[PDB]
Ligand binder design. Structure first.
Ligand SMILES: NC(=O)c1ccc[n+]([C@@H]2O[C@H](COP(=O)([O-])OP(=O)(O)OC[C@H]3O[C@@H](n4cnc5c(N)ncnc54)[C@H](O)[C@@H]3O)[C@@H](O)[C@H]2O)c1
Ligand SMILES: NC(=O)c1ccc[n+]([C@@H]2O[C@H](COP(=O)([O-])OP(=O)(O)OC[C@H]3O[C@@H](n4cnc5c(N)ncnc54)[C@H](O)[C@@H]3O)[C@@H](O)[C@H]2O)c1
Ligand SMILES: NC(=O)c1ccc[n+]([C@@H]2O[C@H](COP(=O)([O-])OP(=O)(O)OC[C@H]3O[C@@H](n4cnc5c(N)ncnc54)[C@H](O)[C@@H]3O)[C@@H](O)[C@H]2O)c1
Ligand SMILES: NC(=O)c1ccc[n+]([C@@H]2O[C@H](COP(=O)([O-])OP(=O)(O)OC[C@H]3O[C@@H](n4cnc5c(N)ncnc54)[C@H](O)[C@@H]3O)[C@@H](O)[C@H]2O)c1
Lengths: 334, 334, 334, 334
């Protein structure tokens, strides 16, 4: 029994719960969010503007969120050191607040009695993992780890296949990315990111991202070879990586597509998907892939210079990978 | 001769400044916003997703926002008691934070050296005014007043005409309303208003509003005769009042429309507008009216039961009224 | 078996197919759409921006659309008289083009060998039915019938309960309505509906509707007692009825809600739904109800004057009713 | 006087009229659109969801569109051969229907009595020009020409500066592009572009474009050195070029920015703009530039491998260029 708690009952926290409730080996013991009371947590979990109503019975009773008859404790602590993880029997904490992304903050959960923490974001200092790429490098002494970003989980599996087969010499990427909770409904204050304060649903908004650099951390051979940027656009979920790369070995576009298709059918099955259909972003709502290569959308300019397109449900694909990483950690430590 | 300061440099604060800079007798001395430094204030005023670039020169210099040569001091105080309104020579404070809407909160501005405060919102206890309806009832001894809500400013002039002519027995109102800064880009916490936390750009969102009942405060004879609710929809600005009203006297629709046209040409000129064109919400972006009657959109069922439709730029029409009420207070107080 | 064909493979045509595939008594023999070839029909049926991917295998094979092994003939006839319904063994035609909504056009399906036609829209000509309101008035001599509009299917069950219990004296309705295929992505020509040509996703757009007067056709006692209008807003599916009604018998809001709840649990089960939750439009994506009463959103101004709010998935609830009406017609004619 | 007519009174046709009415030497004699009657033409010209109301008097009288006293004949011919251009004294036709983009189609305007045609789109046939880049290659023996695409007009001035100063070895472009009139409000038939049939306001939609390869026609030294693709996103106007380019000569990003700033201040003034502000797409609504380099948004991977960002109001910048090309052609003609 993988006994877990969730800190930060937001987009990622609530969807990680949806995914986790479908895994036989996982018991979600408790969640913590100081802004969400038990009855409110039942409301937020049951109804979802992006991914539909939860197919199951959702209520609250006292301090319990009750889903299909399973009782989940709801705590409301601003300070993770005050969450009763150990007294509740929680061994793994999903750290999905966006607030405790460094080792020093995430360690508070272990102080509070958990054993291990998975940060659902890039971490400035916790080791980072992408399932399908380097989760095999996880060892049980690592108590606090990061599942990287949603963009890194799209880019890294694709870059892995391309680099393995043809070699990546250099690459620049853009993610055309759905809006998120950090943005504003109308022009408002965002002192740390002026563009990000502008009306989210009315603008294309250039943004920064460390996701391309981060690929060189989970694929050390690509260290320093990739960088990138983001354009936030008025869709509510699903994002797309636009990867422009110089290759070491010359290829045709068909050969590149065939290498990606082969990986998607074998070692990257369930992580890297493949399509030749006339897909659009809504076609990936609820997709569990980290990366779906759009074969028809990309374009080759030279035998060593190509643009590759790959989709990802930044909320739900990533949330699935959180749970996958959790189960790999529990299996590797058993 | 009117020396004002602006607290809360947001949608209303910044657009009130836009309007004020166009008024002879107004000198904007300072603004206060603890989240917006001077250089950031210049950026937020210059560029607007809804109302376009400020046609003028906007820069910052030290602690001054500089607009077409005029220097405006920028304070950053969370507590209005700490704002040097008096030392700066500010006589009037435009209270547009949404946080100090009661006499208790707005009085802090006077304790800080200002003389009078106009709250850009309904107030639980401050006297309320709607230009064109009851601003002549303002008396100079009133130091803290409210300019009501954008919705009240749309409904009250319309209701005043209908009541003055045919009489209003009772009326139920819906405002189909653009999203505002209190809403969320994706499903997030909103513990005082659960529907309002849901994805703003992807939902029709019911919301309570006292704006129809508040008409009874500015039109005492309509006390208890109007109420209603709101539906927030994914437009970024401009809203519409849908007033279903029972009349005391039998009328034809042509008769109602003529009465409204007469009012808009005479005593409510510039406040109540009138159109017979095939208008949609974007046609009122930047409109200075409080209320624009849409003659072709309404429908009569019986001679005493009719549905009336009136548009309003909830940001800019209201902001213009804020400045209009300020100039009336100053004049009445001379 | 109920052997059917679908004319017009659009939003309604394709969602009617989705519903019908879940009904054991129905065999979908064929579809016709001159603008959609077989492989394109497979794509349009498989991928849906609003209702997700079809959960099942969708391919095309020569002239057949193939869904979970069941083959469906695809015709491409502009003129319904040329569709080989009789030769194909089709007895019922779902007429969902929007082009053939009168008896004269719909009869061409019967000339072509079908037995009966259900028009998925109001008809100037053909008798109209709303399941849960008057489908037991269907008699087998009626060969061509209309399932009314999506708004009429939301308003009529609600009006039936309120009129049955308290009596409706008069009522005025607004539907705040999602955009549809007749609208335009940017300001474009719509010479019969000038407002309807303006940018659909950027505007609140007033529109005329006969849906409230049509209630008086399916509930004859309400003939002449209801009318209304529409406001199109930038959501892509789900709409809401805003009914302002004068009652004959006085009541509390709670008594009104209780009458609707009882109907929803009894004679209008599956047609009229009932909620007290903090719902928004996306919470009814895929709902099979015609009408979901929003208990917390309405408001009462006098014991005989109240505003009632009811939701509907204008695409999917209506499409479910089309199939329900079809099964009622087949059973009534056996 | 440059006497002109406009064929296709759409987004480009109407905005070309707005621009042309501000040029002293141009007389707009007539417009043609079989779907827009004279009074409807006045409505569509007067009200604009994207660019506001026309600041001027707009009426219709008989068969004339009347703008600030100037009468413009309104024709309604589906076949341009039937437009009485000659009898009306029109010398230059702006061909903005999207339907007559080849020499054979546009020639009908000359058979009907016009002298020269400017197609407001790429042509498979007609020589293409981009103002600021190659309009000095226009010669008056050319009777039918193309102003290329809005994306080519953004990319070409940028590529010219970069190629002139550092040399372009090769480049791959993505345009993140606002929706246009060819898209659909909900999933509908688009048999030649399946992705383009999907819900425009709810999807990121990949699309082909020859815009980058077309730069090689107006800058022949760049033939075969650029290509790219498009992602349509739910904004109603303004688009952005994302150019990933390999340089021949090593550069710092600062030298690149400085070269573009210099060109924007001299030989490309009014065509190529330059900004270092925290801009988003709405900040370029109504901009007359072909291309606005976003200095802060771009990123450098190596001294010869860089990503450059440039904005454009695809409707209004391009419409202004159509009028600029017209005046250049007329100066060289007659
Ligand atoms: N949304 C995405 O697409 C996405 C994808 C991958 C990763 N992430 C990352 O996951 C994290 C969460 O993202 P989100 O999109 O779910 O954000 P969110 O804002 O939806 O959720 C954050 C939650 O944290 C809660 N919270 C805030 N302070 C807290 C505290 N002190 N203790 C406990 N709970 C607290 C909030 O109430 C909220 O419910 C962020 O690091 C983000 O970068 C987001
Ligand atoms: N359409 C409208 O937006 C509209 C119309 C009429 C009235 N109003 C009302 O006007 C008020 C402001 O609304 P808004 O839409 O401009 O909101 P907003 O969020 O755009 O602006 C509020 C501003 O107040 C600032 N602020 C927050 N706390 C502060 C403090 N302690 N001291 C000083 N400044 C502070 C914020 O930083 C922000 O800039 C609200 O009461 C609102 O109900 C809004
Ligand atoms: N969308 C809704 O919410 C809704 C709800 C209730 C009723 N309706 C009604 O249903 C009908 C269709 O609506 P929709 O929204 O599905 O529209 P749609 O445009 O999505 O579908 C109409 C289909 O008819 C096809 N078609 C056109 N001409 C044809 C012909 N001559 N023969 C066969 N097929 C043809 C089109 O190619 C298209 O696929 C309309 O009458 C509409 O008013 C729509
Ligand atoms: N951003 C842009 O919208 C943009 C930018 C650059 C170029 N263009 C190009 O300009 C052209 C028009 O684009 P638009 O966006 O203005 O399209 P639009 O659909 O807004 O306008 C096209 C107009 O042509 C009219 N029309 C159709 N058939 C006709 C005929 N036979 N005779 C006369 N008029 C006819 C239509 O009624 C419509 O008003 C296209 O070639 C397009 O690719 C568009």
């Amino acid at each position: 029994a993988i006994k877990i708690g969730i800190n930060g009952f937001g987009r990622i926290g609530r969807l990680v719960l949806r995914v986790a409730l479908g895994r036989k080996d996982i018991e979600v013991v408790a969640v913590n969010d100081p802004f969400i009371a038990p009855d409110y947590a039942a409301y937020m979990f049951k109804y979802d503007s992006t991914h539909g109503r939860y197919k199951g019975e959702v209520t609250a009773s006292g301090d319990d969120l009750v889903i299909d008859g399973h009782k989940i404790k709801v705590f409301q602590e601003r300070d993770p050191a005050n969450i009763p993880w150990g007294k509740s029997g929680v061994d793994y904490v999903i750290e999905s607040t966006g607030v405790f992304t460094k080792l020093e903050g995430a360690q508070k959960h272990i102080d509070a009695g958990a054993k291990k923490v998975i940060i659902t974001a890039p971490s400035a200092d916790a080791p980072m993992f992408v399932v399908g790429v380097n989760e095999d490098k996880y060892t049980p002494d690592l108590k606090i780890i990061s599942n990287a970003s949603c963009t890194t989980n799209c880019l890294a599996p694709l870059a892995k296949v391309v680099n393995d087969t043809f070699g990546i010499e250099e690459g620049l990427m853009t993610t055309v990315h759905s809006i998120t909770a950090t943005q504003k409904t109308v022009d408002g204050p965002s002192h740390k990111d002026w563009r990000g304060g502008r009306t989210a649903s009315g603008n294309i908004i250039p943004s920064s991202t460390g996701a391309a650099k981060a690929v060189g951390k989970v694929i050390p051979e690509l260290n320093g070879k990739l960088t990138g940027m983001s354009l936030r656009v008025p869709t509510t979920d699903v994002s797309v990586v636009d990867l422009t790369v110089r290759l070491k070995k010359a290829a045709s576009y068909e050969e590149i597509a065939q290498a990606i298709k082969k990986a998607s059918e074998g070692p990257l099955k369930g992580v890297l998907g493949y399509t030749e259909d006339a897909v659009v972003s809504t076609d990936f709502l609820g997709s569990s892939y980290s990366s779906i290569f759009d074969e028809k959308a990309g374009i080759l300019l030279s035998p060593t210079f190509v643009k590759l397109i790959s989709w990802y449900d930044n909320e739900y694909g990533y949330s699935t990978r959180v749970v996958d990483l959790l189960e790999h950690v529990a299996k590797a430590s058993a």
